[PDB]
Amino acid sequence: DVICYEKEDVVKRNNINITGGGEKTVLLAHGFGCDQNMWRFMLPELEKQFTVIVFDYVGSGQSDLESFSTKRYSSLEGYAKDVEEILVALDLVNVSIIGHSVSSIIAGIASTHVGDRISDITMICPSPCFMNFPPDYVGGFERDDLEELINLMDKNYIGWANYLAPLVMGASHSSELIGELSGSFCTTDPIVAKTFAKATFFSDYRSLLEDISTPALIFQSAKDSLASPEVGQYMAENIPNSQLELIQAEGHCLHMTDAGLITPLLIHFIQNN
Numbered sequence: 527d528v529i530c531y532e533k534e535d536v537v538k539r540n541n542i543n544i545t546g547g548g549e550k551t552v553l554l555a556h557g558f559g560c561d562q563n564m565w566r567f568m569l570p571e572l573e574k575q576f577t578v579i580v581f582d583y584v585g586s587g588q589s590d591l592e593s594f595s596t597k598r599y600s601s602l603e604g605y606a607k608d609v610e611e612i613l614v615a616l617d618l619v620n621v622s623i624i625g626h627s628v629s630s631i632i633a634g635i636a637s638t639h640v641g642d643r644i645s646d647i648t649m650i651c652p653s654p655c656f657m658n659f660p661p662d663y664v665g666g667f668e669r670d671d672l673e674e675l676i677n678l679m680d681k682n683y684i685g686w687a688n689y690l691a692p693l694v695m696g697a698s699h700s701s702e703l704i705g706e707l708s709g710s711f712c713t714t715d716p717i718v719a720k721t722f723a724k725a726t727f728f729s730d731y732r733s734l735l736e737d738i739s740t741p742a743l744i745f746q747s748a749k750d751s752l753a754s755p756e757v758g759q760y761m762a763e764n765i766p767n768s769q770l771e772l773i774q775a776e777g778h779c780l781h782m783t784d785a786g787l788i789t790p791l792l793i794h795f796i797q798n799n
């Protein structure tokens with residue numbers, strides 16, 4: 527069963543903030559090394575149509591670190607527990623979840639436990655798995671390169687941030703943007719960041735996909751170091767009821783760089799599913 531905390535309890539624990547208005551509610555879930563502030567480019571349009579709920583994963587942003595554990599948050603199932611607990615505790619129903627990157631998988635795990643409160647998922651630049659299993663799956667990242675990334679976190683954290691920020695944001699983008707991500711990386715507790723990075727880039731959730739029965743809208747970045755169009759394509763083929771749209775853009779953060787491209791589309795999806 528899913529624990530039900532006092533509404534009062536999850537709010538402070540997850541730094542929950544509610545804006546907009548109306549009966550239809552959307553829940554926005556951030557990606558690795560970020561927080562709810564990365565949604566600020568989409569919020570205004572979303573708030574014209576929905577009640578918008580944002581939050582910080584325990585350990586992330588301004589969430590309560592007192593709730594963080596390396597045990598629970600060792601894998602994405604502990605993150606999914608965050609979502610399941612917020613939905614149960616606020617007793618929300620008919621929620622559309624919009625997830626960035628890893629939150630695409632987290633939302634999907636949560637939908638296997640509390641599917642009854644979730645109407646659909648929107649997945650922005652998702653990946654089920656970053657490693658390669660050729661020929662039939664190429665996550666795009668060799669084990670040797672991933673080993674080197676996680677290890678760089680131990681040797682030189684500032685170096686790690688400077689390397690990964692442009693990778694995720696897309697090197698063609700502004701210093702303001704890339705720099706915002708490296709700053710977020712830097713201000714995130716190093717143990718949270720290290721265990722979240724392993725749970726994100728070292729996991730394999732391809733077998734999950736066929737068990738996601740919730741309608742899923744996938745946005746695939748046309749040029750994405752972290753996830754090629756074949757990754758998005760693979761996902762749509764395996765999530766039973768899914769729909770992929772390819773977006774002409776660069777980087778792994780379309781909700782930040784190209785909110786104008788994806789927002790009207792996901793709004794239409796959530797309104798008419």
Ligand code: NA
Binds near residue numbers: 550796797
């Ligand atoms: Na609506």
